[PDB]
Design a binder for these strands. Structure first.
Lengths: 208, 43, 171, 16, 137, 206, 234, 357
RNA sequence: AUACAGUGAAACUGCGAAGCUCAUUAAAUCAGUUAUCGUUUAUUUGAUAGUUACAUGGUAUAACUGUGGUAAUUCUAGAGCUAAUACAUGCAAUCUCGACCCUUUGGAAGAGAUGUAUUUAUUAGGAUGAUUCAUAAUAACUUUUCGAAUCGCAUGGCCUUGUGCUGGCGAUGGUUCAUUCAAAUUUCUGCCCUAUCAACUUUCGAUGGUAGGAUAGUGGCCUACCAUGGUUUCAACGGGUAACGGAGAGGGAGCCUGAGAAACGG
């Protein structure tokens, strides 16, 4: 992935859009290094709005400057904050990066504070993009078939790996609910039906 | 009030006596030629 | 050069004492650390023993507590508005304990809206009128209760009630 | 004020 | 009470404006011990004094002395006078002497010039003050 | 004047004295780290590129980086304690007794004393992962069989010496970790027991 | 300072003044310097088992001496009041007690007596995680104490496990050992405790001969009930 | 125009310097670290710098620090810190009276004037009220100290005596300056007035009331500067507006808005450099070089860190700028003038320099 | 001893480096004592931390090899190596309320709960005479600390024969508390003549209050405002003395280490 950054023009590669979509995911990867290489390749795509805020996105990917960067970069009405015209292009790249930090396990006191900071910047964000965080959390959860059918659980989906994924999802929602509380945006697709979907597994699992 | 130097003292402080010597040359412009600008300073 | 020894002072009777001995290191003093608003700048000071102290030379951030609702948030420090000891520290925007400063209302306002679902249940949402006016302005009066020059922190709390009214009268 | 301090001279024999 | 540039308050004592249970501000007080009754004007008072033996952050420990008030002109402190008869062996006779002691007095006590005050040792309040008035008579 | 040229790929180095002043002139006014063409130096050095690394003057005081002067200055340096010592500037000039050069790239002709000769590494890897990197060993492969050995002959006696592998996984380390974990568990067990008897004593008293 | 003159040594070791130029300085340990008995003086100038400090050092490296059930190899280890010195190679157990003269007297004891010691409770307080504990006169921190134990009480400690088997409250009629003042080493029953708050509390003690004396509370060590001491007395 | 930053931090404004020092150990392999050249050794304060001045000889420079409050003196000949001397309190302003660095005056923030000689601190005096500016009068050798109160303090070094103090109509003196040709003293008030005084006698000459039609907000005179011609006079306001006045007429000839609305911390007249008609007006974030006659901006110098003080080495293109950063910043504008003799071969490495626009 | 294994120069780490000569000073030296709930504290002693891993990197170099400059030093530059208790990084449990009262030790559905260090705010509050003391909880903060990638000796108990699981005695480290070694302030007392020494002190704080700065810390120790105070004919202040009856390391200024120094070190 460090070669893909070195491509002189990543745009004119055979499959740039699909590559961008996979780079889109690797930016959301838990491992902060994978995000760095992913962001570097995402920037081989020349885009002026990304170029303006280049240093800030690194300050986020860097662990030491992560806390200071959030208070300056993502605080609403901040002098250095993103301009309204550039929110649509930049703040998507914001979405995965903090998603990756939330994925980082809270195994240390520093990491626990890092997780809290990741959820505490949600109120700065306007509601449609807060839903986008909740959608990203629920994307891994495969729930369409459950509600598509007569609310029946597939045996293949019932696995230890799958339960871990709902556990991560529900924990993120609980932290978001603690922060946003009444201002929390509630949507059927993004949060409610994955939430109900997770509970159906726990009942299907605990019996089966 | 005199304590802490909050009031002014005009007495002789020895250490700074003769810390320098005046420059006898003076200002570049001449004494009378200085006087006249100040009278006309700012109209 | 700074010493806290009492030998240099005059006796209770008013006699001028002679210098008993030269200044010692167990009786030393250091200078004030004039903390001022700006990008965070802190210096470590090795004190006697294995103990160490933080020196806040510059700081623009602080963890301030709304005690009424019992929360604490990290917020920017706008500037010093009033200090009871000396007004020069106010003019120079020097940060010290008991100094009255101006702190951003954004995190407190967001927390209030999220908890109570009301722009800044209803009975609990009611708070003092003066602090409502402060949020409407967008900037809160706060008192620094932490000590920047020893701990390196400028934590504090929002003024409220009698203390708030007293300081508004002083302002 | 009572000092309450042991004194060696009092205990030691002074017969000589 | 609020006659100073700073706001006078008892540290770590919080009165919650929202709750507003009681009109009176919450007041912290302690008994200094030694059978010294804490006066009610301190319990139900409104003064703020960090050096008060009943409401301040000062503890009475050590020698407990008695004296006669000779000066009460300065703020929250007084000067008392203690007299004794010193023995001179060379002529085997006593001579009177006296010593003047500055003592802190809390506003909970009202002291004039001439009364008898019992005072307690405490940490150094100022350059010369190390006592605190704890009983007036 | 003299040139100490080093070829780091071979690790070789050699000294070359010039009598003619044109060569010394062609390096005049350059700076440490700047590159010079070998053809201007001479036909033997044709095609070579030389990076300036430093040097010493007629008085022996060395060249230092960061000082952009042609003359000496007394600069406050370190060997916490700082001493002011004379150091010669970083710009090549006629006052330099010896210049050190590094061969960045090789020319058409081969130098007799640098390119044609080699010097081996003095020591080999000692840490286990360093050995794995040196031999590209897979995780299953054991470093023990690939430890580099040096032969030593004293008189008629001969024997091989190998370094002590550091950070090698051994049964002792596993035993020691297990012992520490068991000690922690046992301490917690003793503590919960003590708390239990204290609770029972309080129940008896109450 | 690191050197102690023999004449400048406090009084209680019974050391002759003219033996040498210097005396052993007690090292840091459970007891204060001015009421401690370093193992060198106990082994050489009281028991005479050793003739010189080097012989004492050989004895301690042999690990034959145990203080409170633990082997000590420091020559100047500060043994003190209510310390058990066990010598297994020769089968002796000794308890260190002041005599009426005020010197430490070498008192032989049984193995059951050796197995335990008595400690005056100097402080009782709650530690971290809300764990109560007690600090005794020898600096021993014992956790989860019996709630009734308070300051000035005496706790009977088992050396092997370092736990509290029993305790004695400080009250009138209790048997008491004096550890300071002129009455050091005297034994008697409490009569009345006179309290000065903010000052040194005073205790009146009556001996078996009906003689009465007053001593500061800091020099008071409860050792048992009248006629039933918990330790063998000299 | 090309502006070069010879020395100073080259990181993003958000990134603090102390982190770069942590990155220093990691980056040592990078070739750029070896190639970077420092002009003066230890030309840095542990946290920040307050003010910078050069000796008249041009052999020597002096600076002050935040912690430990120290007075560095740098020798240009050997490109090193001559020495570091610690002071009891943070320093507000200082002056160098002696041609060399030997003798200096420092107004500290604890209301103290400290005289420092070659050997060390000579003597300390306390003025009645806190001081904000300090200047020497060379003909009379009287030290004139602005004060928070209306009266302006005096200290005559010759007699060594504190003489009678000026009484000013308005309270608060921000900056005081003297004209070498005329000797006129201009005092920069808190209110929108600049007080002009006669040095020889004890008499007021006139008031100038600054007026700005663009903004109705109150503004304070932050700095005052005299040109060597003896006629033109420059004023800095708290609103970021610099006024150039011909002293003979009341009206302002040119008004320049720096655009950021910060206080003007200094004004330096660029006569010696050549093309006499240029001026620097220094704000917290930018010091702009522009022509006194046309008002056109010539060069703009925007550091990554806030500026506290700026200074121009006479006869050269060096600008020394006291900042909040660990490394103090040095700037070079080749077009304005030649590099100093001591930066003799700085011209050689111009292509290697950062080349900020 | 096919990783090495004994001894072991050099080098990197760890610990410790804390007599003389001048001057002279009246209870400001010193001696006794009290308090530190106002304090730092190496070390000793005892307690105290369940919250890629069959073991990470050079992001590393010394010693060492080799090339040279210099009149020259515990003067030097270039090139090439290799290690850590040096330097950075870092990882499927327990306890409660407990229905079913199923069996009446007992199991047990489910509901729950679960580091430490700094700072701030708030709530509750066994110890002492006395506390805002101990301790616990909540909400946040931190250039968020710490929570064994270390070493020697021995090779036991098991079996699920894999070198599979499970292990004995020590050393070196680490958080907090207490203890000890000290230190710093600190209460009261302590034999010269003295008025031919009667006022002294605010004389760049003198007496006290409030707030801040410094400080292991209290404290005019320092700083901003405020009141004119404080000792004294009961001898303040000053003077003399058989008051040998405390200072520096060529001279003044500034700084660095350490638990402890303004160091006989730099």
């Amino acid at each position: 992935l460090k070669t893909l950054s070195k491509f002189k023009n990543i745009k004119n590669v055979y499959s740039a859009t699909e590559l961008h979509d996979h780079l889109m995911v690797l930016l959301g990867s838990r491992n902060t290094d994978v995000q760095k290489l992913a962001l570097d390749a995402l920037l081989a795509y020349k885009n002026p709005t990304l170029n303006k805020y280049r240093d800030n996105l690194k300050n986020l990917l860097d662990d030491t400057l992560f806390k200071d960067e959030i208070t300056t970069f993502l605080t609403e009405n901040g002098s250095q904050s993103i301009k309204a015209e550039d929110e649509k292009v930049v703040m998507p790249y914001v979405l995965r990066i903090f998603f990756g930090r939330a994925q980082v396990p809270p195994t240390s006191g520093q990491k626990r504070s890092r997780k809290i900071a990741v959820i505490s910047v949600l109120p700065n964000f306007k509601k449609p993009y807060i839903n986008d965080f909740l959608s990203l959390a629920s994307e891994r959860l495969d729930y369409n078939y459950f509600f598509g059918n007569s609310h029946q659980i597939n045996s293949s989906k019932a696995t230890l790996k799958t339960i871990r994924r709902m556990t991560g999802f529900v924990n993120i929602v609980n932290s978001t609910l603690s922060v946003l509380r009444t201002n929390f945006p509630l949507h059927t697709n993004s949060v409610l039906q994955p939430l109900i979907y997770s509970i159906a597994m726990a009942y299907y699992v605990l019996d089966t | 009030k005199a304590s802490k130097g909050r009031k002014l003292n005009y007495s002789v402080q020895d250490p700074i006596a003769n810390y320098e010597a005046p420059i006898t040359s003076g200002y570049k412009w001449s004494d009378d030629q200085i006087d006249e600008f100040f009278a006309g300073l700012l109209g | 050069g700074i010493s806290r020894d009492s030998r240099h002072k005059r006796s209770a009777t008013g006699a001028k004492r002679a210098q008993f001995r030269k200044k010692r290191k167990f009786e030393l003093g250091r200078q004030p650390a004039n903390t001022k608003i700006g990008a965070k700048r802190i210096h470590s000071v090795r004190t006697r023993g294995g103990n160490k102290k933080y020196r806040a030379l510059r700081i623009e951030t602080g963890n301030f507590s709304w005690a009424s609702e019992g929360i604490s948030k990290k917020t920017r420090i706008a500037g010093v508005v009033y200090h009871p000891s000396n007004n020069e520290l106010v003019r120079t925007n020097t940060l010290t304990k008991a100094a009255i400063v101006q702190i951003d209302a954004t995190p407190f306002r967001q927390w209030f809206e999220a908890h109570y679902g009301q722009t800044l249940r209803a009975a609990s949402a009611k708070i003092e009128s003066s602090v409502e006016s402060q949020f409407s302005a967008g900037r809160l009066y706060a008192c620094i209760s932490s000590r920047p020059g020893q701990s390196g922190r400028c934590d504090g709390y929002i003024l409220e009630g009698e203390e708030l009214a007293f300081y508004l009268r002083r302002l | 004020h009572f000092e309450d301090r042991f004194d060696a001279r009092e205990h030691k024999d002074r017969s000589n | 009470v609020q006659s100073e540039r700073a706001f006078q308050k008892q540290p770590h004592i919080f009165n919650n404006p929202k709750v507003k249970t009681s009109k009176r501000t919450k007041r912290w007080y302690k008994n200094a011990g030694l059978g010294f009754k804490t006066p009610k004007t301190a319990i139900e008072g409104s003064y703020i004094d960090k050096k008060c033996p009943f409401t301040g952050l000062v503890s009475i420990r050590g020698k407990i002395l008695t004296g006669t008030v000779v000066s009460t002109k300065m703020h929250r402190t007084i000067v008392i006078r203690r007299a004794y008869l010193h023995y001179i062996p060379k002529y085997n006779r006593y001579e009177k002497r006296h010593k003047n002691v500055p003592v802190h007095v809390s506003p909970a006590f009202r002291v004039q010039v001439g009364d008898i005050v019992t005072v307690g040792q405490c940490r150094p309040i100022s350059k010369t003050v190390r006592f605190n008035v704890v009983k007036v008579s | 004047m003299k040139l100490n040229i080093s070829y780091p790929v071979n690790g070789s180095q050699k000294t070359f004295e010039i009598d003619d002043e044109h060569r010394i002139r062609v390096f005049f006014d350059k700076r440490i780290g700047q590159e010079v063409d070998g053809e201007a130096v001479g036909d033997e050095f044709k095609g070579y590129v030389f990076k300036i690394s430093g040097g010493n003057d007629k008085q022996g005081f060395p060249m230092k980086q960061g000082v952009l002067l042609p003359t000496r200055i007394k600069l406050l340096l370190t060997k916490g304690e700082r001493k002011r010592k004379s150091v010669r500037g970083a710009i090549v000039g006629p006052d330099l007794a010896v210049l050190a050069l590094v061969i960045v790239k090789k020319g058409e002709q081969e130098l007799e004393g640098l390119t044609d000769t080699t010097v081996p590494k003095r020591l080999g890897p000692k840490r286990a992962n360093n050995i794995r990197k040196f031999f590209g060993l897979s995780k299953e492969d054991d470093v023990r069989d690939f430890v580099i050995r040096r032969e030593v002959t004293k008189g008629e006696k001969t024997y091989t010496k190998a370094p002590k592998i550091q950070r090698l996984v051994t049964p002792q380390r596993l035993q020691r970790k297990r012992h520490q974990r068991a000690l922690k568990v046992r301490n917690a067990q003793a503590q919960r027991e003590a708390a239990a008897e204290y609770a029972q004593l309080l129940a008896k008293r109450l | 300072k690191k050197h102690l003159k023999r004449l400048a040594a406090p009084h209680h070791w019974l050391l002759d003044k003219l033996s040498g130029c210097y005396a052993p300085r007690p090292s840091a340990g459970p007891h204060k310097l001015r009421e401690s008995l370093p193992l060198i003086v106990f082994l050489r100038n009281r028991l005479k088992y050793a003739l010189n400090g080097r012989e004492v050092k050989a004895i301690l490296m042999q690990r034959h001496v145990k203080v409170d059930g633990k082997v000590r190899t420091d020559t100047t280890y500060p043994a003190g009041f209510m310390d058990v010195i066990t010598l297994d190679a020769t089968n002796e157990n000794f308890r260190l007690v002041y005599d009426v003269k005020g010197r430490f007297a070498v008192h032989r004891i049984t193995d059951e007596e050796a197995s335990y010691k008595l400690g005056k409770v100097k402080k009782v307080q709650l530690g971290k995680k809300g764990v109560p504990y007690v600090v005794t006169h020898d600096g021993r921190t014992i956790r989860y104490p019996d709630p009734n134990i308070k300051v000035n009480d005496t706790v009977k400690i088992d050396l092997a496990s370092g736990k509290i088997t029993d305790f004695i409250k400080f009250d009138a009629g209790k048997l008491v050992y004096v550890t300071g003042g002129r009455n050091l080493g005297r034994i008697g029953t409490i009569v009345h405790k006179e309290r000065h708050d903010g000052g040194f509390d005073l205790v009146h003690i009556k001996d078996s001969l009906d003689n009465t004396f007053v001593t500061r509370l800091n020099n008071v060590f409860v050792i048992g009930e009248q006629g039933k001491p918990y330790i063998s007395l000299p | 125009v090309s502006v070069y930053q010879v020395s100073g931090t080259n990181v993003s404004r958000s990134l603090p310097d102390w982190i770069a020092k942590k990155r220093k150990r990691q980056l040592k392999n990078d070739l750029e670290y070896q190639n970077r050249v420092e002009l003066i050794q230890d030309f840095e304060f542990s946290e920040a710098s307050n003010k910078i001045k050069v000796s008249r000889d041009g052999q020597y420079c002096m600076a002050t620090g935040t912690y430990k409050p120290q007075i560095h003196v740098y020798d240009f000949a050997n490109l090193s810190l001559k020495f570091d001397r610690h002071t009891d309190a943070e320093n507000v302003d200082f002056t160098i009276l002696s041609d060399d660095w030997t003798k200096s005056v420092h107004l500290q923030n604890d209301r103290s004037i400290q005289f420092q000689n070659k050997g060390g601190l000579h003597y300390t005096t306390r003025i009645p009220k806190f001081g904000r500016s300090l200047v020497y009068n060379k003909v009379n050798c009287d030290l004139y100290v602005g004060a928070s109160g209306n009266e302006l303090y005096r200290l005559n070094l010759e007699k060594g005596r504190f003489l009678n103090p000026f009484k000013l109509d308005t309270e608060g003196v921000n900056h005081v300056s003297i004209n070498e040709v005329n000797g006129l003293l201009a005092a920069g008030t808190e209110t929108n007035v600049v007080e002009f005084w006669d040095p020889r006698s004890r008499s007021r000459v006139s008031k100038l009331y600054l007026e700005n039609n663009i903004d109705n907000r109150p503004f304070q005179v932050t700095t005052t500067s005299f040109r060597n011609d003896g006629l033109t006079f420059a004023c800095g306001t708290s609103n970021g507006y610099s006024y150039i006045y011909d002293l003979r007429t009341s009206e302002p000839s040119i008004i320049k808005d720096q655009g950021y609305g910060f206080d003007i911390k200094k004004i330096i007249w660029l006569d010696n450099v050549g093309t006499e008609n240029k001026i620097v007006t220094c704000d917290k974030r930018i010091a702009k070089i522009w022509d006194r006659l046309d008002g056109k901006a010539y060069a703009s110098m925007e550091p990554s860190v806030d500026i506290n003080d700026i200074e121009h080495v006479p006869g050269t293109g060096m600008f020394f700028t006291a900042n909040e950063s660990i490394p103090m910043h040095t700037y070079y504008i080749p077009s304005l003038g030649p590099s100093p003799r001591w930066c003799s071969f700085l011209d050689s490495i111009t292509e290697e320099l950062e080349e900020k626009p």
